[PDB]
Write a protein that binds this ligand. Structure first.
Ligand SMILES: O=C(O)CCCC[C@@H]1SC[C@@H]2NC(=O)N[C@@H]21
Ligand SMILES: O=C(O)CCCC[C@@H]1SC[C@@H]2NC(=O)N[C@@H]21
Ligand SMILES: O=C(O)CCCC[C@@H]1SC[C@@H]2NC(=O)N[C@@H]21
Ligand SMILES: O=C(O)CCCC[C@@H]1SC[C@@H]2NC(=O)N[C@@H]21
Lengths: 119, 118, 119, 118
């Protein structure tokens, strides 16, 4: 019983992650159900993702998103296959907001946990 | 204008060879340090994949898959200091493999990496 | 309707947090269900808490824990009252492992999310 | 030994006055910066409460509650260098007040603070 990163995923915020694994890379499309300020994520709150995925029964993943307005996000996670059979992607993320210069950037990094379930 | 393409070095002694073609970043990462011995394999090198914005002080996000299945990610921004230096200010996460969901709580480390240009 | 920080909470790993407010401070007991390396959290996987709670309806909290073998942890968070009447304590945490020196400390900090519910 | 008790300053210019009592730390933090005008109060100072371990290079964990409801926590270690210099090495989180659960998703920031002595 394997956890397969390829698929369509939904997080606890209601964001959708559509992902295709090929070789050791991932591509696809992230639609965020929220943004940090109006505009940030763009026209349909959507952007391309690019990243890596490991081999194995419970693979690790890492992937990046650049948001239309110049902020950017990164996730690292592992695909686990639960005892009830649900496929689950446990991730932490960083969101990096554009700063004006180095001195004002101390506060430009946010973090959190996204849990993605297959739909 | 700060530019991401080039060869960089961090406070740990690690090296980052980066090349942008537009919004994409590719390259190679050599880490001077490892969480377990050989976790990054014998050359401690891996490929890098990510994104870089446009603008003069662009933001950057990139991932590395390590040889034995851990993976790191960096976000940051390319700054021109007063003195002419180009600096990549980043924060990273290192995700170690875990056996099951229940052991995964302790799987994510973080830190800050300052990359300077060789 | 408010969120009340005082009491016994339980998070996703089964760890129990007992909070007593004394003014702006919080004191109490943390019993972790899990530890890094056997005995890191001491004989009873238990230690005391110290920190702060704000004055809202939905207060923010900050608290810290020194474990027996010297690693330390801190959580920051807010106490939300939900539509269904439930009180959820939403935190993020940092675990600091002891290192021998500055250079080998690069990997000494881990992070996660803890969602506490009231018992 | 590295001694936590004292007056400390970090890369941002913020000042940290702490004293140690058993395994408890107390004192005042004066931040050189804030998220919004006045988040740290008119004087940008607040009390600190936390913990410090025994040993030659002790670990530390402290909190601060800010005037307008946000809060910050630091975890770290007091490393003593070759040159005899004492150095507090930390990572922090800053939680901002949110109106409700759903809109709290982006309410946590982090960073590194490195403190030197006066
Ligand atoms: O606010 C921004 O700068 C762009 C949108 C940010 C979306 C973030 S990425 C991490 C978190 N998880 C989500 O699904 N959305 C938010
Ligand atoms: O430990 C592993 O699982 C593989 C090596 C990780 C190297 C990390 S990546 C974050 C940090 N920055 C560096 O330059 N090296 C370490
Ligand atoms: O591993 C150690 O060094 C001591 C025990 C740490 C337990 C951590 S603290 C954050 C997380 N949440 C819990 O409930 N327990 C773990
Ligand atoms: O913005 C706020 O809500 C309150 C002030 C935050 C000050 C932060 S705490 C982490 C960082 N280190 C400092 O010395 N100052 C900032």
């Amino acid at each position: 019983s394997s956890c397969n990163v390829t698929g369509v995923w939904r997080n606890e915020l209601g964001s959708t992650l559509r992902v295709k694994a090929e070789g050791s890379e991932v591509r696809g499309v992230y639609q965020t159900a929220v943004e940090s300020t109006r505009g940030a994520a763009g026209h349909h709150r959507s952007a391309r993702i690019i990243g890596m995925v490991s081999d194995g029964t419970q693979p690790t993943v890492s992937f990046s998103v650049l948001w239309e307005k110049g902020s950017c996000s990164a996730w690292v996670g592992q695909c686990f296959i639960l005892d009830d059979g649900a496929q689950v992607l446990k991730t932490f993320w960083m969101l990096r907001s554009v700063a004006d210069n180095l001195a004002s950037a101390w506060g430009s990094t946010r973090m959190g946990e996204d849990i993605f379930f297959k739909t």
